[PDB]
N, CA, C and O atoms as a DFTB+ gen file, in Angstrom:
612 C
 N C O
     1  1      55.825     -10.609      18.631
     2  2      56.263     -10.052      17.365
     3  2      57.349     -10.884      16.711
     4  3      58.535     -10.688      16.979
     5  1      56.945     -11.814      15.852
     6  2      57.892     -12.681      15.162
     7  2      58.836     -11.866      14.284
     8  3      60.053     -11.901      14.466
     9  1      58.266     -11.133      13.333
    10  2      59.055     -10.311      12.424
    11  2      58.280      -9.065      12.007
    12  3      57.051      -9.039      12.065
    13  1      59.009      -8.035      11.586
    14  2      58.374      -6.799      11.165
    15  2      58.857      -6.334       9.806
    16  3      59.967      -5.816       9.678
    17  1      58.022      -6.517       8.788
    18  2      58.372      -6.118       7.431
    19  2      58.375      -4.597       7.296
    20  3      57.469      -3.920       7.783
    21  1      59.399      -4.070       6.632
    22  2      59.522      -2.631       6.435
    23  2      59.641      -2.293       4.952
    24  3      60.338      -2.978       4.204
    25  1      58.956      -1.231       4.537
    26  2      58.997      -0.820       3.146
    27  2      58.924       0.685       2.983
    28  3      57.837       1.252       2.865
    29  1      60.082       1.335       2.977
    30  2      60.144       2.784       2.829
    31  2      60.295       3.181       1.365
    32  3      61.094       2.597       0.633
    33  1      59.522       4.176       0.945
    34  2      59.571       4.653      -0.432
    35  2      59.612       6.178      -0.478
    36  3      58.801       6.849       0.161
    37  1      60.561       6.716      -1.237
    38  2      60.710       8.161      -1.366
    39  2      59.925       8.683      -2.565
    40  3      59.917       8.064      -3.629
    41  1      59.267       9.823      -2.386
    42  2      58.481      10.431      -3.453
    43  2      58.685      11.942      -3.487
    44  3      58.505      12.623      -2.477
    45  1      59.061      12.459      -4.651
    46  2      59.288      13.890      -4.816
    47  2      59.290      14.274      -6.293
    48  3      59.413      13.416      -7.166
    49  1      59.152      15.569      -6.562
    50  2      59.140      16.068      -7.931
    51  2      60.325      16.991      -8.191
    52  3      60.569      17.929      -7.433
    53  1      61.057      16.718      -9.267
    54  2      62.216      17.524      -9.627
    55  2      61.803      18.761     -10.416
    56  3      62.090      19.888     -10.013
    57  1      61.129      18.543     -11.539
    58  2      60.675      19.643     -12.384
    59  2      59.599      20.462     -11.680
    60  3      58.608      19.916     -11.196
    61  1      59.802      21.775     -11.627
    62  2      58.846      22.670     -10.987
    63  2      58.901      24.063     -11.604
    64  3      59.957      24.513     -12.048
    65  1      57.758      24.740     -11.627
    66  2      57.676      26.084     -12.189
    67  2      56.346      26.740     -11.836
    68  3      55.494      26.128     -11.191
    69  1      56.175      27.986     -12.262
    70  2      54.948      28.727     -11.990
    71  2      53.738      28.010     -12.579
    72  3      52.692      27.911     -11.937
    73  1      53.888      27.512     -13.801
    74  2      52.807      26.803     -14.477
    75  2      52.032      25.929     -13.494
    76  3      50.856      25.632     -13.707
    77  1      52.699      25.524     -12.419
    78  2      52.074      24.684     -11.404
    79  2      51.987      25.419     -10.069
    80  3      52.873      26.199      -9.721
    81  1      50.902      25.160      -9.323
    82  2      50.673      25.787      -8.018
    83  2      51.646      25.286      -6.955
    84  3      52.359      24.305      -7.167
    85  1      51.669      25.972      -5.803
    86  2      52.549      25.614      -4.686
    87  2      52.133      24.309      -4.015
    88  3      51.487      24.318      -2.967
    89  1      52.506      23.189      -4.626
    90  2      52.172      21.877      -4.086
    91  2      52.645      21.740      -2.642
    92  3      52.011      21.061      -1.835
    93  1      53.760      22.389      -2.327
    94  2      54.316      22.343      -0.979
    95  2      53.206      22.339       0.067
    96  3      53.284      21.622       1.064
    97  1      52.175      23.142      -0.169
    98  2      51.049      23.233       0.753
    99  2      50.090      22.061       0.561
   100  3      49.767      21.350       1.512
   101  1      49.642      21.869      -0.676
   102  2      48.724      20.782      -0.993
   103  2      49.431      19.433      -0.916
   104  3      50.223      19.087      -1.793
   105  1      49.139      18.676       0.137
   106  2      49.748      17.365       0.329
   107  2      49.222      16.367      -0.697
   108  3      48.260      16.649      -1.413
   109  1      49.857      15.201      -0.763
   110  2      49.454      14.161      -1.701
   111  2      48.066      13.630      -1.360
   112  3      47.632      13.697      -0.210
   113  1      47.375      13.102      -2.367
   114  2      46.044      12.566      -2.154
   115  2      46.066      11.214      -1.468
   116  3      45.410      10.273      -1.916
   117  1      46.823      11.115      -0.380
   118  2      46.933       9.866       0.364
   119  2      46.701      10.100       1.854
   120  3      47.035      11.160       2.384
   121  1      46.126       9.104       2.520
   122  2      45.847       9.199       3.948
   123  2      47.014       8.654       4.767
   124  3      47.425       9.259       5.757
   125  1      47.540       7.507       4.347
   126  2      48.657       6.880       5.042
   127  2      49.818       7.857       5.200
   128  3      50.305       8.084       6.308
   129  1      50.256       8.431       4.083
   130  2      51.361       9.382       4.096
   131  2      51.117      10.496       5.108
   132  3      51.946      10.743       5.984
   133  1      49.975      11.164       4.982
   134  2      49.621      12.249       5.889
   135  2      50.050      11.932       7.318
   136  3      50.851      12.655       7.909
   137  1      49.511      10.848       7.865
   138  2      49.838      10.434       9.224
   139  2      51.308      10.047       9.337
   140  3      51.980      10.404      10.305
   141  1      51.801       9.316       8.343
   142  2      53.194       8.883       8.331
   143  2      54.135      10.072       8.501
   144  3      54.824      10.190       9.514
   145  1      54.158      10.947       7.501
   146  2      55.016      12.126       7.537
   147  2      55.061      12.723       8.940
   148  3      56.137      12.969       9.485
   149  1      53.886      12.953       9.517
   150  2      53.813      13.522      10.851
   151  2      54.916      13.014      11.759
   152  3      55.492      13.777      12.534
   153  1      55.210      11.721      11.663
   154  2      56.250      11.112      12.484
   155  2      57.628      11.630      12.088
   156  3      58.280      12.336      12.858
   157  1      58.066      11.275      10.885
   158  2      59.368      11.705      10.388
   159  2      59.553      13.207      10.578
   160  3      60.535      13.648      11.174
   161  1      58.605      13.985      10.068
   162  2      58.665      15.437      10.182
   163  2      58.420      15.882      11.620
   164  3      58.835      16.968      12.022
   165  1      57.743      15.034      12.389
   166  2      57.441      15.341      13.783
   167  2      56.545      16.571      13.887
   168  3      56.811      17.478      14.676
   169  1      55.484      16.593      13.088
   170  2      54.546      17.710      13.091
   171  2      53.124      17.225      13.348
   172  3      52.847      16.027      13.287
   173  1      52.227      18.161      13.636
   174  2      50.831      17.829      13.900
   175  2      50.080      17.562      12.601
   176  3      50.510      17.983      11.528
   177  1      48.957      16.861      12.707
   178  2      48.143      16.537      11.539
   179  2      46.801      17.260      11.593
   180  3      46.015      17.059      12.518
   181  1      46.548      18.100      10.596
   182  2      45.299      18.850      10.528
   183  2      44.433      18.361       9.371
   184  3      44.803      18.503       8.205
   185  1      43.281      17.786       9.702
   186  2      42.364      17.276       8.689
   187  2      41.317      18.322       8.322
   188  3      40.849      19.073       9.178
   189  1      40.955      18.364       7.044
   190  2      39.960      19.317       6.562
   191  2      39.021      18.661       5.555
   192  3      39.448      18.235       4.482
   193  1      37.744      18.584       5.909
   194  2      36.744      17.981       5.035
   195  2      35.819      19.040       4.447
   196  3      35.418      19.978       5.136
   197  1      35.484      18.883       3.170
   198  2      34.605      19.827       2.489
   199  2      33.657      19.099       1.541
   200  3      34.093      18.464       0.581
   201  1      32.361      19.198       1.818
   202  2      31.351      18.548       0.990
   203  2      31.402      19.073      -0.442
   204  3      31.793      20.215      -0.679
   205  1      31.003      18.230      -1.390
   206  2      31.001      18.610      -2.798
   207  2      30.608      20.072      -2.973
   208  3      31.196      20.789      -3.782
   209  1      29.610      20.506      -2.210
   210  2      29.137      21.882      -2.281
   211  2      30.101      22.827      -1.570
   212  3      30.272      22.752      -0.353
   213  1      30.727      23.712      -2.336
   214  2      31.673      24.672      -1.780
   215  2      30.945      25.884      -1.208
   216  3      31.557      26.921      -0.949
   217  1      29.639      25.746      -1.015
   218  2      28.826      26.831      -0.475
   219  2      29.274      27.195       0.937
   220  3      29.379      28.372       1.280
   221  1      29.535      26.176       1.750
   222  2      29.972      26.388       3.124
   223  2      31.453      26.748       3.179
   224  3      31.862      27.609       3.959
   225  1      32.249      26.085       2.350
   226  2      33.686      26.333       2.306
   227  2      33.977      27.754       1.833
   228  3      34.691      28.504       2.498
   229  1      33.421      28.115       0.680
   230  2      33.622      29.445       0.118
   231  2      33.654      30.501       1.218
   232  3      34.399      31.478       1.131
   233  1      32.842      30.299       2.249
   234  2      32.775      31.235       3.365
   235  2      34.116      31.317       4.087
   236  3      34.659      32.403       4.287
   237  1      34.644      30.160       4.475
   238  2      35.921      30.100       5.177
   239  2      37.076      30.431       4.236
   240  3      37.939      31.246       4.563
   241  1      37.083      29.795       3.070
   242  2      38.130      30.023       2.082
   243  2      38.282      31.513       1.785
   244  3      39.252      31.933       1.153
   245  1      37.319      32.303       2.245
   246  2      37.345      33.745       2.028
   247  2      38.449      34.399       2.855
   248  3      39.392      34.970       2.308
   249  1      38.322      34.310       4.174
   250  2      39.309      34.893       5.078
   251  2      39.971      33.814       5.929
   252  3      41.170      33.874       6.201
   253  1      39.181      32.829       6.346
   254  2      39.689      31.736       7.166
   255  2      40.955      31.138       6.561
   256  3      42.050      31.304       7.100
   257  1      40.797      30.444       5.441
   258  2      41.928      29.821       4.762
   259  2      42.743      30.858       3.998
   260  3      43.968      30.902       4.110
   261  1      42.055      31.691       3.223
   262  2      42.717      32.727       2.438
   263  2      43.883      33.334       3.211
   264  3      44.903      33.701       2.628
   265  1      43.723      33.435       4.527
   266  2      44.762      33.997       5.382
   267  2      46.101      33.309       5.137
   268  3      46.301      32.161       5.533
   269  1      47.014      34.020       4.482
   270  2      48.334      33.477       4.183
   271  2      48.972      32.881       5.433
   272  3      49.724      31.909       5.354
   273  1      48.667      33.471       6.585
   274  2      49.210      32.997       7.852
   275  2      48.659      31.620       8.206
   276  3      49.399      30.740       8.645
   277  1      47.355      31.441       8.012
   278  2      46.706      30.171       8.310
   279  2      47.261      29.051       7.437
   280  3      47.461      27.929       7.903
   281  1      47.507      29.364       6.169
   282  2      48.042      28.386       5.229
   283  2      49.496      28.061       5.550
   284  3      49.899      26.898       5.539
   285  1      50.279      29.097       5.835
   286  2      51.690      28.921       6.160
   287  2      51.857      28.118       7.448
   288  3      52.832      27.384       7.610
   289  1      50.899      28.264       8.357
   290  2      50.939      27.552       9.628
   291  2      50.454      26.115       9.468
   292  3      51.121      25.174       9.899
   293  1      49.291      25.955       8.846
   294  2      48.718      24.632       8.626
   295  2      49.629      23.777       7.752
   296  3      49.563      22.549       7.786
   297  1      50.478      24.437       6.970
   298  2      51.403      23.737       6.086
   299  2      52.714      23.430       6.805
   300  3      53.302      22.365       6.613
   301  1      53.163      24.368       7.632
   302  2      54.406      24.197       8.378
   303  2      54.160      23.436       9.676
   304  3      54.601      22.297       9.832
   305  1      53.451      24.073      10.604
   306  2      53.146      23.456      11.890
   307  2      52.421      22.127      11.697
   308  3      52.890      21.084      12.152
   309  1      51.279      22.175      11.021
   310  2      50.489      20.975      10.771
   311  2      50.655      20.506       9.328
   312  3      51.354      21.139       8.537
   313  1      50.009      19.393       8.996
   314  2      50.086      18.839       7.650
   315  2      48.804      19.111       6.870
   316  3      47.791      18.440       7.070
   317  1      48.857      20.098       5.982
   318  2      47.701      20.459       5.170
   319  2      47.194      19.256       4.379
   320  3      47.834      18.816       3.424
   321  1      46.043      18.731       4.784
   322  2      45.451      17.579       4.114
   323  2      43.933      17.710       4.045
   324  3      43.247      17.608       5.062
   325  1      43.416      17.937       2.842
   326  2      41.979      18.082       2.643
   327  2      41.478      17.118       1.573
   328  3      42.161      16.873       0.578
   329  1      40.283      16.575       1.785
   330  2      39.691      15.638       0.838
   331  2      38.168      15.717       0.867
   332  3      37.562      15.805       1.935
   333  1      37.557      15.686      -0.312
   334  2      36.106      15.756      -0.423
   335  2      35.456      14.486       0.120
   336  3      36.068      13.418       0.126
   337  1      34.213      14.613       0.575
   338  2      33.478      13.477       1.118
   339  2      33.145      12.470       0.022
   340  3      33.331      11.265       0.196
   341  1      32.653      12.972      -1.106
   342  2      32.295      12.117      -2.231
   343  2      33.383      11.083      -2.497
   344  3      33.100       9.893      -2.637
   345  1      34.628      11.545      -2.565
   346  2      35.759      10.660      -2.819
   347  2      35.795       9.520      -1.806
   348  3      35.034       9.513      -0.838
   349  1      36.684       8.559      -2.036
   350  2      36.819       7.413      -1.145
   351  2      37.368       7.842       0.212
   352  3      36.739       7.616       1.246
   353  1      38.543       8.462       0.200
   354  2      39.178       8.922       1.429
   355  2      38.170       9.628       2.331
   356  3      38.132       9.392       3.539
   357  1      37.357      10.494       1.735
   358  2      36.360      11.222       2.498
   359  2      35.297      10.312       3.082
   360  3      34.961      10.416       4.262
   361  1      34.767       9.417       2.254
   362  2      33.734       8.487       2.695
   363  2      34.164       7.761       3.965
   364  3      33.425       7.725       4.949
   365  1      35.361       7.185       3.936
   366  2      35.888       6.458       5.085
   367  2      36.045       7.383       6.287
   368  3      35.445       7.157       7.338
   369  1      36.855       8.424       6.125
   370  2      37.095       9.382       7.198
   371  2      35.832       9.599       8.026
   372  3      35.893       9.714       9.250
   373  1      34.691       9.652       7.348
   374  2      33.412       9.854       8.019
   375  2      33.194       8.812       9.111
   376  3      33.074       9.150      10.289
   377  1      33.144       7.545       8.711
   378  2      32.941       6.453       9.656
   379  2      33.954       6.524      10.794
   380  3      33.643       6.178      11.934
   381  1      35.162       6.975      10.478
   382  2      36.222       7.090      11.473
   383  2      35.712       7.790      12.729
   384  3      35.724       7.216      13.818
   385  1      35.266       9.030      12.568
   386  2      34.755       9.811      13.689
   387  2      33.240       9.967      13.599
   388  3      32.647      10.778      14.310
   389  1      32.622       9.185      12.720
   390  2      31.177       9.232      12.536
   391  2      30.716      10.648      12.206
   392  3      29.718      11.126      12.745
   393  1      31.450      11.312      11.320
   394  2      31.115      12.674      10.917
   395  2      29.698      12.744      10.357
   396  3      29.152      11.740       9.901
   397  1      29.110      13.936      10.395
   398  2      27.763      14.115       9.886
   399  2      27.498      15.538       9.436
   400  3      26.746      15.767       8.489
   401  1      28.117      16.496      10.116
   402  2      27.944      17.905       9.783
   403  2      29.165      18.444       9.044
   404  3      30.183      17.761       8.931
   405  1      29.056      19.670       8.545
   406  2      30.151      20.300       7.815
   407  2      30.050      21.820       7.889
   408  3      28.959      22.373       8.021
   409  1      31.207      22.493       7.803
   410  2      32.502      21.825       7.645
   411  2      32.922      21.071       8.902
   412  3      32.284      21.187       9.948
   413  1      33.998      20.300       8.791
   414  2      34.502      19.526       9.919
   415  2      36.020      19.642      10.025
   416  3      36.749      19.199       9.137
   417  1      36.486      20.240      11.117
   418  2      37.916      20.413      11.342
   419  2      38.330      19.862      12.702
   420  3      37.659      20.096      13.707
   421  1      39.439      19.131      12.725
   422  2      39.941      18.543      13.961
   423  2      41.441      18.281      13.868
   424  3      42.002      18.212      12.775
   425  1      42.083      18.135      15.023
   426  2      43.516      17.879      15.073
   427  2      43.806      16.460      15.550
   428  3      43.494      16.103      16.686
   429  1      44.403      15.658      14.676
   430  2      44.736      14.277      15.008
   431  2      46.240      14.112      15.202
   432  3      47.032      14.880      14.657
   433  1      46.624      13.105      15.980
   434  2      48.034      12.836      16.243
   435  2      48.568      11.768      15.294
   436  3      48.053      10.651      15.250
   437  1      49.614      12.123      14.532
   438  2      50.240      11.209      13.572
   439  2      50.999      10.078      14.259
   440  3      51.498       9.165      13.601
   441  1      51.082      10.146      15.584
   442  2      51.780       9.128      16.358
   443  2      50.798       8.107      16.926
   444  3      50.998       6.900      16.793
   445  1      49.738       8.602      17.559
   446  2      48.726       7.735      18.148
   447  2      47.463       7.706      17.295
   448  3      46.799       6.675      17.189
   449  1      47.137       8.844      16.690
   450  2      45.953       8.927      15.854
   451  2      44.680       9.066      16.664
   452  3      43.645       8.504      16.307
   453  1      44.756       9.816      17.759
   454  2      43.600      10.025      18.623
   455  2      43.175      11.489      18.620
   456  3      43.981      12.378      18.892
   457  1      41.907      11.732      18.309
   458  2      41.373      13.087      18.270
   459  2      41.628      13.810      19.590
   460  3      41.188      13.360      20.648
   461  1      42.340      14.929      19.519
   462  2      42.652      15.715      20.707
   463  2      41.676      16.877      20.863
   464  3      41.232      17.182      21.970
   465  1      41.348      17.521      19.748
   466  2      40.423      18.648      19.761
   467  2      39.397      18.528      18.640
   468  3      39.644      17.871      17.628
   469  1      38.245      19.167      18.826
   470  2      37.182      19.132      17.831
   471  2      36.495      20.490      17.718
   472  3      36.032      21.045      18.714
   473  1      36.436      21.017      16.501
   474  2      35.807      22.310      16.259
   475  2      34.866      22.243      15.060
   476  3      35.239      21.750      13.995
   477  1      33.647      22.740      15.242
   478  2      32.652      22.735      14.174
   479  2      32.764      23.996      13.323
   480  3      32.894      23.920      12.101
   481  1      32.713      25.152      13.976
   482  2      32.808      26.429      13.278
   483  2      34.129      27.124      13.590
   484  3      34.432      27.408      14.748
   485  1      34.910      27.393      12.549
   486  2      36.199      28.055      12.712
   487  2      36.137      29.498      12.220
   488  3      35.224      29.874      11.485
   489  1      37.113      30.300      12.632
   490  2      37.171      31.701      12.231
   491  2      38.614      32.196      12.196
   492  3      39.502      31.590      12.796
   493  1      38.838      33.300      11.491
   494  2      40.172      33.878      11.377
   495  2      40.795      34.095      12.751
   496  3      41.964      33.776      12.971
   497  1      40.007      34.640      13.673
   498  2      40.483      34.905      15.026
   499  2      40.453      33.634      15.869
   500  3      41.422      33.311      16.556
   501  1      39.335      32.918      15.810
   502  2      39.176      31.684      16.571
   503  2      40.243      30.665      16.184
   504  3      41.060      30.263      17.013
   505  1      40.228      30.253      14.921
   506  2      41.194      29.281      14.423
   507  2      42.582      29.552      14.992
   508  3      43.181      28.686      15.630
   509  1      43.086      30.758      14.757
   510  2      44.405      31.144      15.246
   511  2      44.513      30.928      16.753
   512  3      45.360      30.167      17.220
   513  1      43.651      31.604      17.505
   514  2      43.646      31.483      18.959
   515  2      43.764      30.023      19.383
   516  3      44.675      29.654      20.126
   517  1      42.838      29.197      18.906
   518  2      42.838      27.777      19.239
   519  2      44.178      27.138      18.894
   520  3      44.870      26.616      19.768
   521  1      44.539      27.181      17.616
   522  2      45.797      26.607      17.155
   523  2      46.965      27.088      18.007
   524  3      47.608      26.297      18.697
   525  1      47.234      28.389      17.954
   526  2      48.325      28.976      18.721
   527  2      48.326      28.464      20.156
   528  3      49.369      28.081      20.686
   529  1      47.152      28.460      20.780
   530  2      47.040      27.992      22.149
   531  2      47.474      26.549      22.305
   532  3      48.115      26.190      23.294
   533  1      47.126      25.718      21.328
   534  2      47.483      24.305      21.363
   535  2      48.979      24.114      21.134
   536  3      49.612      23.271      21.770
   537  1      49.536      24.904      20.222
   538  2      50.958      24.824      19.907
   539  2      51.806      25.243      21.105
   540  3      52.829      24.624      21.399
   541  1      51.372      26.295      21.791
   542  2      52.101      26.777      22.950
   543  2      51.826      25.953      24.192
   544  3      52.708      25.766      25.029
   545  1      50.597      25.460      24.312
   546  2      50.208      24.653      25.463
   547  2      50.873      23.280      25.415
   548  3      51.600      22.900      26.333
   549  1      50.618      22.543      24.338
   550  2      51.191      21.212      24.170
   551  2      52.605      21.297      23.603
   552  3      53.577      20.979      24.287
   553  1      52.710      21.729      22.350
   554  2      54.008      21.847      21.711
   555  2      54.214      20.815      20.621
   556  3      53.596      19.751      20.641
   557  1      55.084      21.129      19.668
   558  2      55.368      20.220      18.564
   559  2      55.800      18.852      19.081
   560  3      56.157      18.706      20.250
   561  1      55.766      17.855      18.204
   562  2      56.154      16.498      18.573
   563  2      57.566      16.472      19.148
   564  3      58.282      17.473      19.104
   565  1      57.960      15.323      19.685
   566  2      59.288      15.166      20.266
   567  2      60.194      14.359      19.340
   568  3      59.716      13.573      18.521
   569  1      61.501      14.558      19.478
   570  2      62.452      13.844      18.646
   571  2      63.705      14.651      18.374
   572  3      64.365      15.118      19.303
   573  1      64.036      14.815      17.098
   574  2      65.220      15.571      16.705
   575  2      64.893      17.053      16.546
   576  3      63.805      17.412      16.096
   577  1      65.842      17.905      16.917
   578  2      65.654      19.348      16.817
   579  2      66.283      19.890      15.537
   580  3      67.436      19.593      15.226
   581  1      65.515      20.686      14.800
   582  2      65.994      21.268      13.551
   583  2      65.803      22.781      13.547
   584  3      64.681      23.274      13.663
   585  1      66.905      23.510      13.415
   586  2      66.861      24.968      13.400
   587  2      66.330      25.482      12.066
   588  3      66.923      25.236      11.015
   589  1      65.209      26.196      12.117
   590  2      64.594      26.742      10.913
   591  2      64.626      28.267      10.930
   592  3      64.251      28.894      11.921
   593  1      65.076      28.856       9.826
   594  2      65.149      30.303       9.734
   595  2      66.277      30.881      10.567
   596  3      66.620      30.343      11.620
   597  1      66.860      31.990      10.090
   598  2      67.964      32.663      10.782
   599  2      67.513      33.337      12.074
   600  3      66.335      33.296      12.428
   601  1      68.459      33.955      12.774
   602  2      68.160      34.635      14.029
   603  2      68.107      36.147      13.829
   604  3      68.949      36.721      13.138
   605  1      67.114      36.784      14.440
   606  2      66.949      38.228      14.327
   607  2      67.194      38.911      15.670
   608  3      67.010      38.306      16.726
   609  1      67.610      40.172      15.619
   610  2      67.874      40.916      16.837
   611  2      69.270      40.671      17.374
   612  3      69.643      41.233      18.404
């Protein structure tokens, strides 16, 4: 390793209001960042692919995603990142794991980038069980500790 070029760039929005949806959940339309953040934030990376046809998604988006808990978790615990196949990001992602069916949900590591788990069909009960089990079994990334939320009881 002769030399290592570094280029950090900060990105955020000052102006905000109801007129606009809760971007906090919807991550940027970038792949690099998704994995990147995982490091700094030290959180898991959750990928979500949805074919142009929302016929299959509409099903999950009903209770699966609709679940405020699932969104709050996938946004907090993991990094909410979804992209259509038609788009470029989606096209590539396919070759990555040689995707073919849909929907397609999996948990990748923002540190190593190696598929740890793979699930074809998710559910309100299943999704949670699996996720929760992984969070408690493995645990959030390692690094700096940050106290979130006050103490009760």
